[PDB]
Design a protein around this ligand. Structure first.
Ligand SMILES: CC(C)(COP(=O)(O)OP(=O)(O)OC[C@H]1O[C@@H](n2cnc3c(N)ncnc32)[C@H](O)[C@@H]1OP(=O)(O)O)[C@@H](O)C(=O)NCCC(=O)NCCS
Ligand SMILES: CC(C)(COP(=O)(O)OP(=O)(O)OC[C@H]1O[C@@H](n2cnc3c(N)ncnc32)[C@H](O)[C@@H]1OP(=O)(O)O)[C@@H](O)C(=O)NCCC(=O)NCCS
Ligand SMILES: [Mg+2]
Ligand SMILES: [Mg+2]
Ligand code: NA
Lengths: 464, 229, 464, 229
């Protein structure tokens, strides 16, 4: 009852509440399921329809001549308990309850009855009040959100419906590759803890991003225990809703709950090795970098820049994150002195001057990455007439390939429309690129933050 | 078993431990406290005072005292067998007088606490995370500025150390004008044990070790309150 | 002279060092001057050429049969003093010295002599070591940066070269309308105070953004005095380079200067009513909002959202900036209750729920703006199935127009590619729109931070 | 003119004002100081101490001694002439023994300072911004935690008020356990006047009012340093 393998990888899924009316939510889910390419059996359930979207329809899940793993329930709340009973009779393992009108509108009684009854059949509940879920490795889009996402290794769990389903679309724009989207909504039964356990053991998932408004009473200890063990291998980024006192009360009112302690949540996340994001932008910028790079093996981070200004913005940003640069290895300085002028600066950042052509980015990036005393690289570029943005990007691509290793790299590029395209180009290659030097630096700082978070957890688990 | 202190209190419907009991309970977990004895007779108070060493504080022990200072239930800086016998009778005579309807548990003989760096160690129960330890510097730093750190128990050595270094008043522990660096290992050790107390004793609702005094070598809890549920 | 009217609006400009070779810096500047459409006289200056780009060329400025206001000097440092002498003889008022190789490479004597020589002829020096300057109202692009910018009211002053010329290009991407770009580089003579004095009086300029590494010894008092009075009418945003100790050293070596005190600069900025941005993105987000909006008349800020999660992100972001939301006026709550369901929230943020169709954004936005007791509005949108991003955006535009008034508005929209277009649509109409609720809230916070900064200055200038 | 003190010091090749001269100077600007007399005789001290009232504090005024306490140049709480009189010779010996290089301007007689909330008011010259005033709370708050605010002079009333509210230890001014709120207006007044001293007197490189005591009514500068250039 605590393994979620058949939720994410079902053989058969029923959609209860799909209709001949294509505008209904049930129908929208069914359309996403078929167009995203689910290869198992899909069972529309409707009282009267003979078929929906070319599939044989049944009036009850219990009429389906097959073992249904998952039932996506899109009927009004006054109908839900009846569908649960029939799912229970049919041996359904998971009820994914889209339906709203439970604890979030003050009807806790109905919600607790829903969970009570599902459990009497050995059935778990996701939600209620959710937009569904997606699992890319099973080609399963059981949401009424966008019909597609970029495939990748990021799992995104959201307690928020509207922001969750919107961020699902935002991942495409920000080039974030997704393994799963899970709407948890009211969290009446299955929650973050249950999901982390699954994503811990999921080889398709390498990073976990959570939008979290609150943890249930009595559940926090289990949360730290699971998240800390996940964090040893996979970074967890939490966007905490209500991270200010004022906001905690606002979240405390949005959900129907008393306001958790801000300070104690912060400490729980630290003890979990969790990275707390203060914003969507930070969370996505960090997710990109953590998805696409290994953690650095040491603190010999190099910043390479064709302008002092960007370098100083970077330095200040790194310093705000407790990251301080040190002198570059003399082997590296010697390597770069082969092509840069003598009024170049080598303090770290390594300033190759505003006169640097495209090729110096290739040569500079290659030299840094191949050097055995360099652990990570942030490449900064300010667009000038002596260069082309795409040429610089392609230089970075080639240097990364040539070096034939994986050291973390982030790229900050500042300029006009040509830079926007070059940055887009890099991100499509899964090279973490950003349109400012502070964002590229913030993203690299996330890689270090995670390495320090993992180390915190390792140390706290040390055997006496 | 030190749990007898908790069971005894529960049976008598009390919602907290008496201050000497809280100290004994804490002590049983290996948290150092300022030395104390419960005097049954005047002869014992005198003998305890010699054992503990002068100067001693004498105070009435009874579940009835809302404020021990103003029932004439506290005599201070007693430096001799003479002065002990004197205060041992003024207290009882004065406390019998001003609150006759009050079971006198006894009179507490308390060791002098040399001055040092004051700390707060606390334990509370968060609805989400359960027993949580709190650390802060004493005086105005917690009371006025609320400069505190929290770790969810049980605490590892890593948790204890980082939560100490995290408070804004940390430098008061590493040496400043007129004060040597204090024993951080002792502090870590007390924090971990405070967490253990909270994890193991579900009947303890909260705990405040305050003041705790840190010295170049070791720490000593001066006062301890434990609330039951 | 101290008056820069004829630096920015010259009748005649000379380009010294333009060449038959179109790759050289002088030639790039000359090319930008002609393409951006300068209407005065342009005089290419070159030792041998008879004409450059269809214009009569002269060997010396002093041979030009005209009064030359501005000489743009793009010859090597060893020839600069010679050109200054000639310009001096010719009665030139402003020498815009592109050339590098002065104080920033350790040649102090040469820089001081450049200035000494200019002043003996009553000539002011911009630079040296700069990429030039642009002034849109004079259709004057005397830079070798991008050929074009969007026209508007923002003046951007930059002490950094490479970052400066790249940010010039970034303004286009971020839809920021520019009145002026000024590279000040080494600041050997003309500096921020002189420019601020000009932009104070310039009716084309409404907002001043400065990338600032440092101020000259003995110049800071005058800086406060001037910036203070400017801030009474025009917002100044400063991107401070070296606002951490390690970064202060980082900028100390890029520039040829010692690092000033971080804490005292920050107090000086506070006494000047200046908004200090810690990043390019913050500065540009804030500049955009300050450029397109009046300051709020009071504190009755309303947040309108179709998502609870977005609303709490906003609340937290406002709280971090010292901005706290108050319950909306009862008349507004009544106006909105006419179309929203009972499970809508009115705590502020006003949550019109996730099922809000496009036109509820029109009606909601209109009601808030028209209401006498609402001073400012932040509108948050999460892309759901029931809305269209562009429809929501057009509703916000229509509501702003139909309200008639000018109250500050910012917009935060989350979703896929359709949101990115809607956001772009709003920005091209000069409605400050952002792809996340935190950036929309941070932008509105800047409008309030500026109102508060202006108040700080007004109170400090109080008569005794 | 009080500028005569600056001129005298410059003429004698000195690079700071003597403690009593510093306080006279400060006082002439309307910043309140603890009362003082410079004793040129064992007899005059004892009188000046009779006059100023009691108790008094005695310390050495010498162009050559800077950190006074560790050379034994500071004696305290001297209620009778006789109580003082031993101190006069007592310090004299102690400085004679340990600074025979030092020149003895006299011994300083200092009026007593009731305890209060201690403050620092500083004046420095920043290369960019010129005369700058700084504020912070005394003791560990400036010295250890570096909790200070700055404002470029001259200071408006707004500058003074906001820089006081800005420091982290600000709540030490608005009442806490065993301490009333102090006179914020009087602090603001002194801050503004400190700024005026810097703007007007180019010969002053630096000034340190430390400690300054804040009371419910008024403030008093206890010690002042003025550095010349
Ligand atoms: C779940 C919800 C969408 C259903 O609303 P609806 O589609 O308008 O409701 P309906 O009554 O039309 O029922 C849907 C279909 O299920 C059918 N149905 C009803 N009871 C049924 C049952 N026991 N078994 C199978 N089908 C059933 C209905 O007949 C209808 O099909 P039809 O069009 O052929 O008649 C709605 O109640 C709801 O909760 N909306 C908000 C949900 C939400 O936003 N959640 C996400 C938060 S991010
Ligand atoms: C200013 C700078 C670009 C000139 O270098 P350059 O163009 O390669 O040098 P040149 O000598 O070829 O260019 C000067 C041109 O003007 C001519 N010239 C030289 N002295 C002259 C004079 N006194 N009067 C008129 N023309 C003169 C030269 O003949 C040449 O023209 P040509 O092609 O016909 O021979 C270079 O010295 C420099 O400083 N580069 C960096 C600038 C920079 O980046 N600044 C901003 C940092 S953001
Ligand atoms: Mg929610
Ligand atoms: Mg909602
Ligand atoms: Na440079």
């Amino acid at each position: 009852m605590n393994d979620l393998e058949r939720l994410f990888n079902p053989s058969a899924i029923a959609v209860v509440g799909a209709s001949k009316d294509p505008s209904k939510i049930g129908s929208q889910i069914l359309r996403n399921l078929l167009s995203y390419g689910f290869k198992g059996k899909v069972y529309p359930i409707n009282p009267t329809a003979d078929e929906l979207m070319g599939l044989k329809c049944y009036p009850k899940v219990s009429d389906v001549p097959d073992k249904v793993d998952v039932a996506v329930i899109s009927v009004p709340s006054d109908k839900v308990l009846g569908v649960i009973d029939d799912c229970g009779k049919a041996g359904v393992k998971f009820a994914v309850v889209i339906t709203s009108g439970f604890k979030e509108v003050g009807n806790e009684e109905l919600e607790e009855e829903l969970v009570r009854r599902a459990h009497s059949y050995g059935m778990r509940v996701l939600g209620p009040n959710i937009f569904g879920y997606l699992y890319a490795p099973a080609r399963l889009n059981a949401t009424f959100g966008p019909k597609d996402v970029l495939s990748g290794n990021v799992a995104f769990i959201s307690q928020s419906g509207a922001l969750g389903i919107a961020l699902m679309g935002y991942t495409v724009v920000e080039n974030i590759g997704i393994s799963s989207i899970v709407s948890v909504g009211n969290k009446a039964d299955l929650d973050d803890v249950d999901l982390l356990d699954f994503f811990d053991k999921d080889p398709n998932t390498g990073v976990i991003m959570i939008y979290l408004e609150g943890i249930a009473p009595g559940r926090g200890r289990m949360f730290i225990d699971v998240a800390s063990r996940v964090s040893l291998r996979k970074p967890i980024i939490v966007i905490k809703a209500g991270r200010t006192e004022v906001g905690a009360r606002a979240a405390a009112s949005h959900t129907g709950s008393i306001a958790g302690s801000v300070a104690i949540y912060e400490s729980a996340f630290k003890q979990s090795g969790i990275l707390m994001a203060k914003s969507v932008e930070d969370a996505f910028d960090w997710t990109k970098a953590l998805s696409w790079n290994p953690i650095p093996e040491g603190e010999r981070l190099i910043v390479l820049t064709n302008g002092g200004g960007a370098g100083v913005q970077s330095t200040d940003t790194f310093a705000d994150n407790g990251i301080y640069l040190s002198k570059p290895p003399e082997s590296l300085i010697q390597e770069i002195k082969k092509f840069v002028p003598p009024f170049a600066s080598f303090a770290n950042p390594i300033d190759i001057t505003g006169m640097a052509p495209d090729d110096w980015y290739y040569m500079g990036t290659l030299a840094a990455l191949k050097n055995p005393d360099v652990d990570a690289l942030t490449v900064l570029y300010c667009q000038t007439a002596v260069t082309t943005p795409i040429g610089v990007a392609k230089g970075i691509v080639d240097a990364i390939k040539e070096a034939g290793n994986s050291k973390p790299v982030t790229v900050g590029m500042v300029g006009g429309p040509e830079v926007a395209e070059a940055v887009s180009f890099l991100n499509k290659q899964r090279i973490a690129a950003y349109p400012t030097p502070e964002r590229a630096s913030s993203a690299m700082s996330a890689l270090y933050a995670y390495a320090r978070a993992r180390s915190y957890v390792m140390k706290s688990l040390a055997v006496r | 078993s030190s749990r007898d202190l908790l069971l005894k209190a529960k049976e008598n419907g009390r919602k907290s431990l008496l201050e000497h009991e809280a100290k004994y309970f804490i002590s049983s977990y290996g948290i150092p406290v300022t030395n104390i004895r419960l005097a049954k007779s005047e002869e014992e108070a005198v003998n305890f005072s010699r054992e503990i060493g002068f100067p001693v504080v004498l105070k009435i022990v009874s579940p009835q005292v809302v404020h021990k200072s103003d029932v004439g239930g506290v005599k201070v800086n007693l430096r001799s067998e003479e002065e002990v016998r004197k205060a041992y009778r003024e207290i009882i005579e004065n406390v019998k007088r001003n609150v006759p309807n009050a079971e006198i548990e006894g009179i507490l003989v308390q060791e002098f606490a040399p001055p040092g760096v004051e700390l707060i160690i606390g334990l509370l129960r968060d609805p989400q995370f359960g027993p949580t330890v709190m650390f802060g510097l004493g005086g105005v730093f917690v009371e006025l500025f609320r400069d505190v750190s929290f770790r969810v128990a049980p605490l590892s050595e890593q948790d204890a150390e980082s939560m100490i270094k995290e408070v804004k008043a940390y430098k008061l522990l590493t040496g400043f004008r007129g004060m040597e660096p204090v024993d951080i290992e002792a502090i870590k050790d007390a924090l971990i044990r405070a967490g253990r107390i909270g994890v193991e004793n579900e009947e303890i609702a909260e705990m405040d070790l305050n003041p705790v005094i840190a010295y170049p070598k070791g720490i000593k809890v001066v006062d301890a309150r434990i609330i039951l549920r």
